Ligand binder design. Structure first.
Ligand SMILES: O=C(Nc1cccc(-c2nnn[nH]2)c1)c1cccc(F)c1
Ligand SMILES: O=C(Nc1cccc(-c2nnn[nH]2)c1)c1cccc(F)c1
Length: 259
């Protein structure tokens, strides 16, 4: 039923849809193209922020560390970082800016703090994600070229990792709480997964988009039942395709009605 509905949605959308649900009530999973690779785009910002949080477990002052923002550091979407040019932002501010505003300059500073895109991948491997790969910095990590393995993961792997980070023991308790607080404070998510969920439910999420009309969202959801983790990835055959947040909302609604 749910599988057929997601297939119909995908067909009418003209693109390629990837879905992974984990229901933590009983570990049930719903997968649609769960093991195909998709470009993560800004959903990768969660892994970068989480890695810096992991570093902060052994450097308790790390989130207070100032980082210089120079004019040359500004890239293509810098809603927070542009205010601090020729000044500084703390690693906490950079994490919040990347997660809650999807600031690309902020993400680049997180990547640099981790020793480059490979440092983000190394953290993923350390927590048991063998699928995630970050290869590039912003903005080129969002090129989303069909068939390109760079900066991709699978819906199954990202759902598992998001669960470990937000509901499991990948991070210390304080760090896990901070990540959840940041995600719940996202400003960019109302039109995506959360648009397809009952209004009484609470959630945190991280969106992403790129070329090929790539439109992504990953969410942790608190419904009268145990939390859910939901990943919805979507990408289209033409480089200049329009974003389709409505497709993510539709996939989420199909999932929610199928519960
Ligand atoms: O894997 C990483 N850190 C990590 C992973 C798992 C456990 C721990 C740890 N911290 N204190 N004890 N163990 C650290 C990591 C963090 C930042 C950058 C990087 F490349 C790797
Ligand atoms: O950087 C890009 N997009 C971008 C930048 C900042 C935030 C987001 C975003 N989309 N949904 N959440 N965040 C997307 C980008 C778009 C097209 C091609 C490209 F190379 C990069």
């Amino acid at each position: 039923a749910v599988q057929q509905k997601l297939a119909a949605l995908e067909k009418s959308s003209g693109g390629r849809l990837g879905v992974a649900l984990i229901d933590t009530a009983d570990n049930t999973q719903v997968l649609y193209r769960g093991d195909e690779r998709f470009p993560m785009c800004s959903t990768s910002k969660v892994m970068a922020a989480a890695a810096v949080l992991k570093q902060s477990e052994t450097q308790k002052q790390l989130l207070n560390q100032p980082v210089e923002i120079k004019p040359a550091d500004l890239v293509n979407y810098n809603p927070i970082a542009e205010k601090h040019v020729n000044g500084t932002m703390t690693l906490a501010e950079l994490s919040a800016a990347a997660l809650q505003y999807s600031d690309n300059t902020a993400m680049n500073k997180l990547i640099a703090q981790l020793g480059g895109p490979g440092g983000v991948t190394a953290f993923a491997r350390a927590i048991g994600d063998e699928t995630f790969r970050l290869d590039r910095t912003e903005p080129t990590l969002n090129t989303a070229i069909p068939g390109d393995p760079r900066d991709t993961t699978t819906p199954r792997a990202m759902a598992q990792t998001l669960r470990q980070l937000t509901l499991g023991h990948a991070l210390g308790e304080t760090q896990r709480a901070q990540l959840v607080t940041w995600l719940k404070g996202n400003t960019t998510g109302a039109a995506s997964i959360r648009a397809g969920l009952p209004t009484s439910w609470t959630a945190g999420d991280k969106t992403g988009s790129g070329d090929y009309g790539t439109t992504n969202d990953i969410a942790v959801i608190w419904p009268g039942r145990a939390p859910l983790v939901l990943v919805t990835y979507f990408t289209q055959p033409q480089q200049n395709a329009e974003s389709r947040r409505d497709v993510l909302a539709s996939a989420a609604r199909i999932i929610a009605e199928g519960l």
